[PDB]
Amino acid sequence: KQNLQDTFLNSVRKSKTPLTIFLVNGVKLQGVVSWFDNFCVLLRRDGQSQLVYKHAISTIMPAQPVQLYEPSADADD
Amino acid sequence: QNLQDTFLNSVRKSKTPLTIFLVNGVKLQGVVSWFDNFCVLLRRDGQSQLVYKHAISTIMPAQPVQL
Amino acid sequence: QNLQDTFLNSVRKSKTPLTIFLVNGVKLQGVVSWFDNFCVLLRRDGQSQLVYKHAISTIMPAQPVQLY
Amino acid sequence: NLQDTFLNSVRKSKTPLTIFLVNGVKLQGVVSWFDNFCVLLRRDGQSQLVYKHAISTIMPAQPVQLYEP
Amino acid sequence: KQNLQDTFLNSVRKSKTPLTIFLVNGVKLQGVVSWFDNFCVLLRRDGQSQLVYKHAISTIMPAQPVQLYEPSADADD
Amino acid sequence: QNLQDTFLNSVRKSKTPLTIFLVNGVKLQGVVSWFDNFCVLLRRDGQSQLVYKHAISTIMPAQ
């Protein structure tokens, strides 16, 4: 159904998992994903939410393991 | 409507002061006065410059908004 | 016209002296004489220079431009 | 294609990889999932979404076997 | 007819104008454009030809003034 | 056909050694054994490496 990005982003948003965003320029932002579309992610931190462009993000690391139902390495996609 | 349009229209309609963080580590301050698919018009101290969305990494409003 | 087209066509038709700030911090000065989907022709006096917009951070006019 | 064959191969084989990013930092782990824009790198109990647009190279620790046209 | 990029590249190719291609990472390439497509430019320097990707190009500087037939500032393009 | 396809197929068919310059300054050497729309497969000394075109600045062949 959903791809890898939508599954990952919807999962960490529905579970409100604390995250760490590693921007390509080395800046690190923390918070939770409250909303995302095709080009950006809305990061909520305390009461302040900031828009982060996907094109500026390198990695998104959850603070705790998150259930993504990743495909098994025994069969194809 | 999506998140980016809602966010940008909100911070525009509300004259919200914000901080544009660029991918090169440069910070910009001002108010978004106009935006399209690829850029935004940031006004500060009466001077408005064209900022390209691929140069923007984050947009942080000084006062939060909602939707 | 959209924001980008209105801004670029106005500083072009008006020959507004500009300062293009690149993503690598390099500053370019001149006047836009032509632009398309990806590039911008920056000419300062007798010299031409094709500037790719993906390398542009911000464009700041030397004088405030009335865009309407 | 090449990218899909390579990524599927190192995924199904769970090959230990080293992902070099454009900003120079090095990532170690196994690719468990990938789409058109991102790659899911698993190391220990950690899962890290990595965007393809920020990757420079992907090199496997052990040699990979691919069938080319 | 042609847009700015196609006019610029075809002109410096047809006239074999010596160029200085500035990359985003600060390094400067010199030579003559012998061929180009939507994403790449083949720069020739002596008898060496190297593929230059447009996504790494910041500016392109011709060594001499080049005729481009730019639009007049008095009318709309 | 297109320049990039012609250039890449040429150095692949002839197995010409080349130097891949990345946008972060790193230099890679090897032979292109396979490529698609977004990546190339650079092989050197039996080790194959998936290189993303969007990270490449220039490709200079040795010959």
Residue numbers in the entry:
A (entry chain D), E (entry chain B): 6 to 82
B (entry chain E): 7 to 73
C (entry chain F): 7 to 74
D (entry chain C): 8 to 76
F (entry chain A): 7 to 69
Could you pull the original sentences from the published paper?
The RNA chaperone protein Hfq, a member of the Lsm/Sm protein superfamily, is widespread in the bacterial kingdom, where it facilitates gene regulation by small noncoding RNAs (sRNAs) and other types of posttranscriptional control. The structure of the Hfq “core” region from several different bacterial species has now been solved, and in all cases a conserved hexameric ring structure has been observed. Appended to the core of Hfq is a short variable N-terminal extension (NTE) that is usually only four amino acids long and a longer variable C-terminal domain (CTD) that is predicted to be unstructured. The CTD of Hfq in E. coli has recently been proposed to autoinhibit RNA annealing activity, as acidic residues at the very C-terminal tip of the protein mimic the nucleic acid phosphodiester backbone to displace RNA from the rim.
We have solved the X-ray crystal structure of Cc Hfq to 2.15-Å resolution, including the structure of the entire length of the Hfq CTD. Purified full-length Cc Hfq was crystallized, and the structure was solved using the Ec Hfq core hexamer as a molecular replacement search model. Four Hfq hexamers could be modeled in the crystal asymmetric unit, packing in an unusual arrangement with the hexamers positioned orthogonal to one another to generate an “open square”. From the electron density maps, residues in the short CTD of Cc Hfq could be visualized for several protomers within the asymmetric unit, in some cases allowing for modeling of the entire length of the CTD with a high degree of confidence. On modeling the Cc Hfq CTD, it became apparent that these extensions pack against the CTD of neighboring hexamers in an antiparallel manner. The Cc Hfq CTDs that are not directly involved in contacting neighboring hexamers are partially disordered. From the structure of Cc Hfq, it is clear that the acidic tip residues (DADD; residues 78–82) pack against the positive rim residues of the proximal face (R18, K19, and K21), with few direct contacts to the arginine patch on the distal side of the rim (R49 and R50). Specifically, aspartates 81 and 82 are positioned to make electrostatic interactions with lysine 19 and arginine 18, respectively. Finally, glutamate 75 from within the CTD forms a hydrogen bond with arginine 49 and serine 39 on the neighboring protomer within the Hfq hexamer. These interactions agree with the proposed autoinhibitory mechanism in which acidic tip residues pack against conserved positive rim residues on the core of Hfq to compete with nucleic acid binding to the rim and disfavor spurious RNA annealing events. The well-ordered CTD–rim interactions observed in our structure suggest that the short Cc Hfq CTD may provide even stronger autoinhibition than the longer and more flexible Ec Hfq CTD.
